[PDB]
Amino acid sequence: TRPTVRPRNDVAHKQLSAFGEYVAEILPKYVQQVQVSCFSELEICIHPDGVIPVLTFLRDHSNAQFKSLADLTAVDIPTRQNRFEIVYNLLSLRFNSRIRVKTYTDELTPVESSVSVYKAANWYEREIWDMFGVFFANHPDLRRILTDYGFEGHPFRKDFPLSGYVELRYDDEVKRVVAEPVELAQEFRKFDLNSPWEAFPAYRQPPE
Amino acid sequence: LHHAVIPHGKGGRSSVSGIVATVFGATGFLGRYLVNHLGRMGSQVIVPYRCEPYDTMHLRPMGDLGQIIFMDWNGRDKDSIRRAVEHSNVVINLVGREWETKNFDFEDVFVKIPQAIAQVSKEAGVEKFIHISHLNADIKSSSKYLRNKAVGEKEVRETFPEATIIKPADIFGREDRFLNYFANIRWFSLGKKTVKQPVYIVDVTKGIINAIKDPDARGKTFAFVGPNRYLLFDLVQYVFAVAHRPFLPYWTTRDKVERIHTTDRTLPHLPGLEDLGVQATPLELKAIEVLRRHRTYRWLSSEIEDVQPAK
Amino acid sequence: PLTLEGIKDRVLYVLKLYDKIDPEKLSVNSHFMKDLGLDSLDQVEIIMAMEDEFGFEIPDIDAEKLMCPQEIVDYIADKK
Amino acid sequence: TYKYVNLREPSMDMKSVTDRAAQTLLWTELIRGLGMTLSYLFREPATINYPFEKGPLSPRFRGEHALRRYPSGEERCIACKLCEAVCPAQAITIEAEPRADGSRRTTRYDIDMTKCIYCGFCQEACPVDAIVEGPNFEFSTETHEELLYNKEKLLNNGDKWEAEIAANIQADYLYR
Amino acid sequence: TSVKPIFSRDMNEAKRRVRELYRAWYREVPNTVHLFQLDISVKQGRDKVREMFKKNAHVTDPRVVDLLVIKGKMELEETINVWKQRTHVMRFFHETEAPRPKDFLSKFYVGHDP
Amino acid sequence: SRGEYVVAKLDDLINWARRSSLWPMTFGLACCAVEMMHMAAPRYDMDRFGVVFRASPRQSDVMIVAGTLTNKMAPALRKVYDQMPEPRYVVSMGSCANGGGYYHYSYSVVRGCDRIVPVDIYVPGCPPTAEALLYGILQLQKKIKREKRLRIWYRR
Ligand SMILES: NC(=O)C1=CN([C@@H]2O[C@H](COP(=O)(O)OP(=O)(O)OC[C@H]3O[C@@H](n4cnc5c(N)ncnc54)[C@H](OP(=O)(O)O)[C@@H]3O)[C@@H](O)[C@H]2O)C=CC1
Ligand code: SF4
Ligand code: SF4
Ligand code: SF4
């Protein structure tokens, strides 16, 4: 209770509750979910056709300034009809606030390239292109950053394995570096670390 | 056979091949490319060196983790050669210096070396001994070099009779001896009519590794000749045309000039490249590879500027 | 010298100059797509090879709709 | 609370402007910088003299990956694999067999000194304190083969000193 | 299931784009093999270029063909720049064998495998 | 035996001369580079041993590969390493470089820098101490005491 347990707040909780209902009231075209965790950081869950309207509204409108940006990593999730999650993380300057904009997408449908409204978004967008492969229509510059040039395969997906397919070594047969299929000297013994006996009772989805 | 000699998986970078090699020499050229293809093939390579450890550091990163191993040896003992072939699947004899020192002649290298190692190898119970030699070894005169290699072939077919004697013709490669001798002509050239047929080094060592992994190789000596068979003066025209250095035709022993002005003949008494089943590559593209040194920024980049016929 | 025979001779010797042509067999209705066994890949190879030899801008739709060497002759005749 | 910088202005008094001019001419505080450096020049230097005067350490330092044993006793490890289960780069290869009595042991206990990262997590996880970080850090190996320790290498490494490790743990067991 | 497009509305503009990229890669190869100081004839390079185009012959979805065109145009950006190296362009070649067979018999002697 | 005697004296001269200066260059990828900078810290001097920084690849003797060698780096590493004179030496400094280490099971990471260059001296520790790195350089100097190159050349 008082020791060892982080005391939850109520002021920011009720305020972000009211603010989420405010945003849901004022943009009914592009609101699907508003949600608040116990530690009170706002999440707004979004169809990817009003990304530029929500961002132009959130940087402006003077009821919420939201100048500052943090990354949008589209965390790779199978089993959904639309796979990936673009995660904006907006951090205001006049309010000390944190909202998240989770819009969803899938493997081929482009989203509308938030570089034109946040200049910070450019290298983050090139990063998510090079690592996942969500193509960004209406964008000035799409190179590949934080990989090899000749490499492809978008390695942060769940389909790409832990060690890569290609492997570089040197040979004096052509006096240069060449690529080879992968050969590991030790198996990387995966560990089964998933306990039974219902680790959390509150988070049971309704069973089939 | 003992276990962990059996093959395992896709070859390359710690796939245990069926061979454990013992390579004589290997500090210089041909043995280095042979160790290179064995480390790609993924074997365990015992190599002796009688020299400074820098060349053995040079061929260190070729094999995988701990697949190669080093020792010391000489042409004067028997314990070191016996300790080399204590545990050897296959063993190859590459040795031979192009010039005589003040201690080791062209005599007694091809007499003292292959007799000793052949005798202790046959007494050590190895398989598939492969000794290299040159083409056109004659018992007759005009080459101390080639007659000593002829006596070497005689000794290695004499003792351990199901060996494999392999002769190529002259070989050209990424660090060739003879075209890098044609480097030194640029500061000074001799032209006579003589046919010649070089062969590129990596298909030579491809044929060597196929013949060392494949039995039927014992007994029958083999001859490795490229598809070229052309004239000396066309080679000199070709190399100074690829180098784009202007020319007016007219570390060296006279045995060198006797080698390059002897002859190059053929022998249909024995099979060769494609009869063993390995591809032969022509001269020209490997010449564009190996002539990058001499150009110096005038015509440094060129490919198809010159073609020279065979015969 | 820009008559019909100049254009036809120049297209003739540069399709001679092409290497993988199967067989030689040039005609005014040769139709190297479906009579000589050539893909759309080799179609656009040949068209921009003409463009490399002496050509114009040769826009990709007008480059794309030629298909036959005598029509290439008439095309350069229309454009040059 | 904040304290911002360069709220300053050139004062327009004559002594002020002529002192700024004299500093413009002679580079006077440049000479003050020279004087500060000479004040560290005549200061006595502080190095050590490596083969003879080694640098200091700490009692909790992380070294060797050696092994202990009981007072005149068995190998203290009991093959419980907690060290591999915390080993972050999986550099602990353990294959176990019981010995010829019924008591349980190992066969193969290999530490990859390359792939190790010297956490101390295998110090914190070993239930009997059988694997211990050593004090000394001098491996310095001319081959790649000879940084892969087998079991008998580890136990001959742990028998090169114990009174060392006993002293460090005895002075350090209450803390952790 | 009307997916938003990439560039086109059917496959005809996709065919136009991929043939335009093949035009660009045709005219850009001898510049690179003259520039990186390699050891390969030009016709070998052009033929492996068209082989790498023919590797993807079965592709039919228009978004996917557009995305291959975007990949190829990004690599031609990286080869009109000299941002890549000799190693990558030789890595497109498959010259250090890798002579791995296709017969059943050789895959049986060198086995544990189909 | 005056010939081998004089050649032995001269070989001892040049090997002493080689182990004398040994200035490296600074490749220095990650936090092992910070340990190199603390090997340039005044509490553990390298200039007691004539060991100087030299950022050009054209006059260093040894070269310290120190950091996590990736695929985007490794051809540039060897294309630095080769254009360097004939006595060349490699210090693999750190768990990342001496066998892959903590990023061993990943894409884009060279599993041990024997796959690019040869290695004379491994110095493990993540990071090494300044003391351990200095011990490795002293052992490399003792390797240069163990050369007998010119004796080999004469007795050939
Ligand atoms: N066309 C042909 O068939 C020809 C074939 N060859 C063969 O090609 C191979 C490569 O050629 P090349 O580079 O010139 O030769 P090598 O590099 O193989 O030279 C012989 C090797 O054995 C060592 N060696 C030589 N003489 C002695 C000796 N007296 N005592 C002890 N060790 C000795 C040398 O040591 P180190 O260098 O370390 O001092 C060297 O490593 C050789 O096997 C050669 O015979 C050569 C010419 C023509
Ligand atoms: S944690 Fe200790 S007792 Fe357990 S297996 Fe590892 S070394 Fe042995
Ligand atoms: S200190 Fe080394 S061996 Fe021990 S758990 Fe960490 S990485 Fe593994
Ligand atoms: S070995 Fe350790 S200290 Fe060195 S680069 Fe890797 S993580 Fe950093």
mmCIF file of C-alpha atoms in Angstrom, chain B residues 56-197:
data_model
loop_
_atom_site.group_PDB
_atom_site.id
_atom_site.type_symbol
_atom_site.label_atom_id
_atom_site.label_comp_id
_atom_site.label_asym_id
_atom_site.label_seq_id
_atom_site.Cartn_x
_atom_site.Cartn_y
_atom_site.Cartn_z
ATOM 1 C CA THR B 56 52.032 -18.096 -41.260
ATOM 2 C CA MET B 57 50.120 -15.139 -39.763
ATOM 3 C CA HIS B 58 49.363 -14.208 -43.378
ATOM 4 C CA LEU B 59 47.669 -17.505 -44.041
ATOM 5 C CA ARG B 60 46.060 -17.578 -40.558
ATOM 6 C CA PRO B 61 42.635 -16.002 -41.311
ATOM 7 C CA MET B 62 41.987 -18.296 -44.268
ATOM 8 C CA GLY B 63 40.661 -21.311 -42.414
ATOM 9 C CA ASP B 64 37.917 -21.123 -39.829
ATOM 10 C CA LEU B 65 38.250 -21.149 -36.009
ATOM 11 C CA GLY B 66 41.185 -23.429 -35.251
ATOM 12 C CA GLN B 67 40.872 -25.459 -38.439
ATOM 13 C CA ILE B 68 44.422 -24.760 -39.523
ATOM 14 C CA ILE B 69 47.483 -25.677 -37.483
ATOM 15 C CA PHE B 70 51.175 -24.872 -37.796
ATOM 16 C CA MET B 71 54.462 -26.596 -37.154
ATOM 17 C CA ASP B 72 58.170 -26.302 -37.906
ATOM 18 C CA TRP B 73 60.259 -28.541 -40.147
ATOM 19 C CA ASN B 74 63.415 -28.616 -42.243
ATOM 20 C CA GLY B 75 65.091 -30.495 -45.030
ATOM 21 C CA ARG B 76 67.506 -32.010 -42.526
ATOM 22 C CA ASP B 77 65.544 -34.040 -39.950
ATOM 23 C CA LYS B 78 63.088 -36.923 -39.841
ATOM 24 C CA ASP B 79 61.258 -36.372 -36.550
ATOM 25 C CA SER B 80 59.540 -33.238 -37.807
ATOM 26 C CA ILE B 81 58.277 -34.814 -41.023
ATOM 27 C CA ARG B 82 57.151 -37.903 -39.100
ATOM 28 C CA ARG B 83 55.342 -35.691 -36.602
ATOM 29 C CA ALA B 84 53.741 -33.903 -39.545
ATOM 30 C CA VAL B 85 52.355 -37.110 -40.997
ATOM 31 C CA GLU B 86 51.416 -38.803 -37.731
ATOM 32 C CA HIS B 87 47.744 -38.138 -38.465
ATOM 33 C CA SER B 88 47.121 -37.193 -42.067
ATOM 34 C CA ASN B 89 44.394 -38.190 -44.457
ATOM 35 C CA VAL B 90 45.962 -36.608 -47.538
ATOM 36 C CA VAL B 91 49.406 -35.118 -48.100
ATOM 37 C CA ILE B 92 50.714 -32.964 -50.922
ATOM 38 C CA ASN B 93 54.278 -32.173 -51.870
ATOM 39 C CA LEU B 94 54.725 -28.612 -53.011
ATOM 40 C CA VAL B 95 58.312 -27.500 -52.585
ATOM 41 C CA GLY B 96 60.895 -25.948 -54.851
ATOM 42 C CA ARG B 97 62.761 -22.680 -55.008
ATOM 43 C CA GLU B 98 63.383 -20.892 -58.285
ATOM 44 C CA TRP B 99 67.002 -20.076 -57.432
ATOM 45 C CA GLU B 100 69.815 -21.921 -55.723
ATOM 46 C CA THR B 101 71.134 -20.627 -52.424
ATOM 47 C CA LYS B 102 74.627 -21.232 -51.099
ATOM 48 C CA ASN B 103 73.417 -24.240 -49.084
ATOM 49 C CA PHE B 104 70.621 -25.931 -51.071
ATOM 50 C CA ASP B 105 71.235 -26.615 -54.746
ATOM 51 C CA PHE B 106 68.717 -27.671 -57.346
ATOM 52 C CA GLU B 107 70.440 -30.937 -56.743
ATOM 53 C CA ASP B 108 69.384 -32.589 -53.443
ATOM 54 C CA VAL B 109 66.126 -30.673 -53.083
ATOM 55 C CA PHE B 110 64.318 -32.925 -55.554
ATOM 56 C CA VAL B 111 66.423 -35.847 -54.369
ATOM 57 C CA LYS B 112 66.648 -35.436 -50.608
ATOM 58 C CA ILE B 113 63.148 -34.015 -50.096
ATOM 59 C CA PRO B 114 60.732 -36.308 -52.033
ATOM 60 C CA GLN B 115 62.525 -39.575 -51.215
ATOM 61 C CA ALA B 116 62.428 -38.809 -47.491
ATOM 62 C CA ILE B 117 58.838 -37.623 -47.293
ATOM 63 C CA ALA B 118 57.630 -40.309 -49.696
ATOM 64 C CA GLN B 119 59.333 -43.011 -47.655
ATOM 65 C CA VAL B 120 58.024 -41.845 -44.290
ATOM 66 C CA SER B 121 54.587 -41.262 -45.842
ATOM 67 C CA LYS B 122 54.336 -44.766 -47.278
ATOM 68 C CA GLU B 123 55.622 -46.068 -43.954
ATOM 69 C CA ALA B 124 53.088 -43.847 -42.174
ATOM 70 C CA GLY B 125 50.096 -45.317 -43.994
ATOM 71 C CA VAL B 126 48.702 -42.229 -45.698
ATOM 72 C CA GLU B 127 46.381 -42.238 -48.683
ATOM 73 C CA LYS B 128 46.392 -40.153 -51.862
ATOM 74 C CA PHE B 129 49.870 -38.685 -51.889
ATOM 75 C CA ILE B 130 50.048 -35.948 -54.512
ATOM 76 C CA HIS B 131 53.369 -34.598 -55.741
ATOM 77 C CA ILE B 132 53.491 -31.633 -58.053
ATOM 78 C CA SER B 133 56.040 -31.106 -60.812
ATOM 79 C CA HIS B 134 56.507 -29.169 -64.039
ATOM 80 C CA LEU B 135 55.743 -30.063 -67.631
ATOM 81 C CA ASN B 136 58.546 -30.917 -70.151
ATOM 82 C CA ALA B 137 60.828 -32.555 -67.631
ATOM 83 C CA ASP B 138 63.565 -34.177 -69.721
ATOM 84 C CA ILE B 139 66.316 -36.489 -68.558
ATOM 85 C CA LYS B 140 68.554 -34.681 -71.061
ATOM 86 C CA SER B 141 70.436 -31.403 -70.704
ATOM 87 C CA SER B 142 69.736 -27.652 -71.111
ATOM 88 C CA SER B 143 67.877 -27.358 -67.797
ATOM 89 C CA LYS B 144 69.358 -28.259 -64.427
ATOM 90 C CA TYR B 145 65.940 -27.246 -63.126
ATOM 91 C CA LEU B 146 63.859 -29.485 -65.354
ATOM 92 C CA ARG B 147 66.195 -32.453 -65.167
ATOM 93 C CA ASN B 148 66.087 -32.337 -61.368
ATOM 94 C CA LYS B 149 62.310 -32.285 -61.538
ATOM 95 C CA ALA B 150 62.524 -35.236 -63.938
ATOM 96 C CA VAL B 151 64.553 -37.164 -61.374
ATOM 97 C CA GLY B 152 61.962 -36.103 -58.786
ATOM 98 C CA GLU B 153 59.149 -37.591 -60.876
ATOM 99 C CA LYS B 154 61.256 -40.726 -61.282
ATOM 100 C CA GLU B 155 61.704 -41.080 -57.514
ATOM 101 C CA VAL B 156 58.058 -40.406 -56.663
ATOM 102 C CA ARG B 157 56.852 -42.940 -59.219
ATOM 103 C CA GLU B 158 59.611 -45.249 -57.926
ATOM 104 C CA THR B 159 58.574 -45.336 -54.281
ATOM 105 C CA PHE B 160 54.891 -45.423 -53.235
ATOM 106 C CA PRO B 161 53.789 -46.400 -56.746
ATOM 107 C CA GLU B 162 50.109 -45.487 -56.456
ATOM 108 C CA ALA B 163 50.839 -41.809 -55.911
ATOM 109 C CA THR B 164 49.669 -38.996 -58.157
ATOM 110 C CA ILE B 165 52.213 -36.916 -60.028
ATOM 111 C CA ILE B 166 50.598 -33.756 -61.377
ATOM 112 C CA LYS B 167 52.338 -31.479 -63.835
ATOM 113 C CA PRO B 168 50.877 -28.259 -65.119
ATOM 114 C CA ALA B 169 52.509 -25.989 -67.654
ATOM 115 C CA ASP B 170 53.546 -22.500 -66.543
ATOM 116 C CA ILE B 171 50.887 -20.895 -64.361
ATOM 117 C CA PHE B 172 49.676 -17.309 -64.267
ATOM 118 C CA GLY B 173 47.781 -15.863 -61.340
ATOM 119 C CA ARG B 174 46.916 -12.867 -59.146
ATOM 120 C CA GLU B 175 50.485 -12.920 -57.800
ATOM 121 C CA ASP B 176 52.088 -14.741 -60.739
ATOM 122 C CA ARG B 177 55.819 -15.271 -60.918
ATOM 123 C CA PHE B 178 56.404 -14.911 -64.636
ATOM 124 C CA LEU B 179 54.166 -11.978 -65.589
ATOM 125 C CA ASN B 180 55.582 -10.205 -62.560
ATOM 126 C CA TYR B 181 58.913 -11.023 -64.149
ATOM 127 C CA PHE B 182 57.574 -9.294 -67.283
ATOM 128 C CA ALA B 183 57.185 -6.297 -64.969
ATOM 129 C CA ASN B 184 60.974 -5.965 -64.797
ATOM 130 C CA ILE B 185 61.378 -5.918 -68.585
ATOM 131 C CA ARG B 186 59.688 -2.478 -68.598
ATOM 132 C CA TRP B 187 62.799 -0.790 -67.187
ATOM 133 C CA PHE B 188 64.847 -2.403 -69.968
ATOM 134 C CA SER B 189 62.868 -7.452 -73.766
ATOM 135 C CA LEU B 190 63.953 -10.512 -75.754
ATOM 136 C CA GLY B 191 61.927 -11.986 -78.588
ATOM 137 C CA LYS B 192 62.148 -15.459 -80.136
ATOM 138 C CA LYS B 193 59.652 -17.876 -81.649
ATOM 139 C CA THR B 194 58.420 -20.380 -79.026
ATOM 140 C CA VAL B 195 54.942 -21.711 -78.317
ATOM 141 C CA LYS B 196 53.548 -21.461 -74.806
ATOM 142 C CA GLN B 197 50.347 -22.384 -72.980
#
